[PDB]
Symmetry: D2
Subunit: 313 residues, 4 copies
């Protein structure tokens, strides 16, 4: 461990939190009213160590939607249940060339990776096939509860309804993937879209999410229950792709400067993993031009430059 | 006129027809059974001069679907009813860079031109807005009857039903254009898709189609009725775009070597215009790798190399 | 002929000239001092009919460099001496997809067409192979004299020297084409670049250039000498490509709205052809964002909208 | 440490070596005779731990050229002498979108990263500016000697001469970067190319190279001399970019499946780093379709799947 005194570490998290707090730039997402509602001043950071030690500061009990933060989690589930090889017959393993989610496939007509919409849509089609959407949803909720050691995991029906109604681009992607035969045989593509919108609409708090991150940090064992949630293979794949593909078009800079597996989402969440050390969830709705939470980005840079957490430190 | 003796010209058309007939390569389209049905050996050529003189050879009374051959016709209708400026607020004026129908927009987020699917879908949304799809369809059928001087214009319901069921790519394009706000306000995109599939499913014969081509060749006046069908502006726009965008990825080579406005379709039709001389429709189901009728392409090359019909001869 | 009274036509040219004159926008090219020198207020239009009738207005005797205006001319020479088939083993036949001169090749690793730099560089390598650069240059000067019926054809040594010194992009293209084996065996690529810079540096006046344009308008016969300068094949190819590829990224709009073969150049020249009617050269140094002379573009639009000269009028 | 018994580890390296040995596919590079000379059956693996423990098997004393293996090393030197911020004013920080070395720049007109040719060419221009090429070369040779703890570092004059004569693509890149102003003011671009060719032509053995790799594995301290060669910042940057950009178009798959910083080269070398554990150099001339040594790739996969060396194991 690189944290001898947890309490002193705590004291530093608070200092970084406080420094990030002064960063007021960015714009709260407003493509649906359920995101536009949110106050720009909301800002929470929660830590859950591999030990099971906890620390929160700021708004760490206000629920918000995982949104793209869910992409690594459902990917992790797919690999856990199906293994690396099956999953990757359907989706690639690396950063899309140009901009994030520009609607195309790789040389093999597979979405580039699970962290872009096309890829997450396909991953969604792989999970618990055969059963109805209601059972699919329950199965995943249950899985996230395990990842979160039974802490806050809810569902925003209003976000779901708005996502489905306004999600023209995701429908375009759905039909495109159908044309290119990207789904396993017998897939109801529209039903898969619905399931996808639902998954984006799952709600968490910084506190519960940090436990999910910590489970990934802990080889797939939930640090506050001790139970095995994910296969080692699942964790490793997920971390690799979070490392390279997790921060939209900022993934490259993030890997270089921060060097940690992370996944941002349009609600302003940033799911952060320090392998063998801790999980974290940082949350603040206002987003930069690349769609990453302004405060969270700032906090991540400061955290690594302070605690020498970079992959290659 | 560049045809002093029509009868002698006739005799030459027959020779070219006969030479093209020996070209057996290519593949009949089979993405729907309504296209796969067709015999590879079907081959017709019909001419209608600006004078109103007629000549057919081969299978010139077997109905087949316009398919993309309809794109210039509905574009012509849009401009006729709405003028160049309005239409082109919605669709561009030039060859898409890369491959034909690769799903993207130009710098202004407009489809590149009316001869690609995205562009024709948008053009379809412009026609007779406000009225229901049934009236839209009738209005256009009536318009084509005028273009064809009341000769064969029918409708393939089976093609329509199959186009809608198998048209995932067109649905992707529909949703993409909706996301990018490419349609006039208050557009039912799905309804527009339906209308689009219907238009592709309109049936003609070489004989009736050649009269449509001749109307374009004749400044928008139907050479066998004498009535004005299209505005001069409409004809000129349509010819310009047929010249540069009408033969899929072969448009460039076709312009260079043949130099005539034309529009191919997946049923194997090639609508050909010799400005101020005649209209023609050539038809043969087997298509080359670029989607153009093998016999028709061969015939077009021979026709120009013989009668010096090239734009810049 | 579409010009019954030449004198009345003359009177109209003057009106259009005068209207264009009020268009003061645009920027004189300044990448070399030899272009930056030029006054923005210079503006000339010269007409030479297929008959041999002449008319000039404004600054039609001030020499300026052909620059890219030379591309169609040397292409025409290559085809004249070597035939279509040989030339096009080396260069394509159609508009490059994206922006003009973005440095790449087509599917067959050939430059897209002769009107872009990569293509003109290759065309230059085809002309009078075997002889030294001095003889190559003389041969071409002589050819242009024939095209111009012995009117002004000079050479700007200062432009040449500056083009070679500042032409890093053309050197990059030279080496790229060498890597991809785009030149005939035994080509001195650097020497070909030199020759290319020289050709760009050939000087003309509106008056002499319009005779060159008129020769193209007249099936390759110089209207003021009556001698055959270019093969019919050469003229037709050149016109086709001028039609589609001649106005940089504005080629598409120009074809649609004007419908005439033309070729612009960075000195502000626009070589215009009205097939079977006349040649023209319009010249005014200030260029729009696409590199086309602002006054010339304006004048071309007005000319067609007035005299119904559009290809498909 | 994850190696308790070095001798037992040794025994396993030998087993993997032996297994890789049976992989006979791939093609020895032949774009210059100096590469084509090499036997396909040559195959060496050398390990140098952070401890300073050593082990070799196979052809680990036959000199070969670093080629692209040098890219991370000179990048490391640039950052060491100039700091991250200066270096990255000139070159980017992340994987190029499409194929490796396809000749273009990022949004800011900088080469995408130091591991592609355009980027390494620019990095080369940054080193020891002001002094002549001879001193530049000596300075770097001296630096590599330090990295290698004074083991084999030579120079292939024949490779240099052939690289310069056949390097048309690199010259194209040189001129392109000059046009786009990618070099620090006052750069002799041609001289920089020369220097670049020289650096590619530096010779090493598996044994000496593994010590260079080990220096990177050891926070920039040479494990067999104990001296500080590189700044911590330099090492971390280099490792990050090796991780994401080091294996040409295979970088994505390599990161996912192997999860180690590596850099391949066309001579068949693969410079491998296991942070805080060891450096390795694997070498075998025959390359796969992506330009990576067939045996080395195979060996790397097996090594991680055996010793759990993956970044996220
Ligand atoms: C990755 C992100 O949060 C965007 C989420 C949104 N629902 C989408 O585009 O699917
Ligand atoms: C242009 C062509 O004939 C393809 C027609 C087909 N229905 C389509 O892709 O819309
Ligand atoms: C086509 C044009 O006038 C640009 C000319 C200039 N010399 C060049 O880029 O070669
Ligand atoms: C990266 C690699 O080894 C190719 C090296 C070669 N000299 C080059 O293209 O510069």
């Amino acid at each position: 461990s690189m944290i001898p005194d947890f309490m002193s570490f705590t004291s530093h998290i608070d200092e970084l939190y406080e420094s990030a707090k002064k960063q007021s730039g960015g714009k709260v997402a407003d493509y649906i009213p359920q995101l536009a509602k949110f106050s720009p001043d909301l800002w929470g950071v929660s830590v859950c160590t591999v030990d099971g030690q906890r620390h929160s500061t700021g708004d760490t009990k206000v629920p918000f939607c995982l949104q793209s933060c869910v992409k690594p989690l459902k990917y992790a589930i797919a690999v856990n249940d199906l293994g690396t090889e099956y999953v990757h017959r359907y989706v690639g393993k690396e950063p899309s060339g140009l901009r994030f989610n520009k609607l195309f496939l790789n040389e093999d007509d597979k979405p580039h990776n699970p962290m872009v919409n096309a890829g997450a849509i396909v991953v969604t089609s792989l999970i618990k096939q055969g059963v109805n959407n209601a059972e699919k949803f329950d199965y995943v909720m249950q899985f996230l509860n395990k990842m979160a050691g039974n802490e806050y995991v809810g569902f925003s029906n209003a976000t779901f309804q708005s996502e489905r109604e306004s999600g023209d681009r995701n429908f375009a992607i759905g039909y495109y993937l159908k044309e290119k035969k990207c789904f396993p045989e017998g897939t109801d593509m529209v039903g898969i879209l619905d399931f996808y919108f639902q998954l984006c609409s799952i709600e968490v708090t910084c506190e519960s999410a940090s436990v999910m991150a910590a489970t990934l940090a802990n080889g797939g064992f939930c640090p506050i229950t001790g139970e095995r949630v994910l296969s080692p293979e699942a964790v490793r794949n997920t971390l690799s792709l979070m490392h390279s593909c997790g921060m939209y078009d900022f993934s490259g800079q993030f890997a270089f400067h921060v060097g940690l597996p992370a996944k941002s989402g349009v609600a302003g969440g940033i799911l952060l993993v320090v392998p063998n050390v801790m999980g974290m969830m940082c949350w603040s709705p206002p987003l930069d031009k690349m769609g990453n939470s302004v405060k969270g980005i700032h906090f991540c840079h400061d955290l690594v430059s302070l605690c020498n957490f970079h992959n290659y430190d």
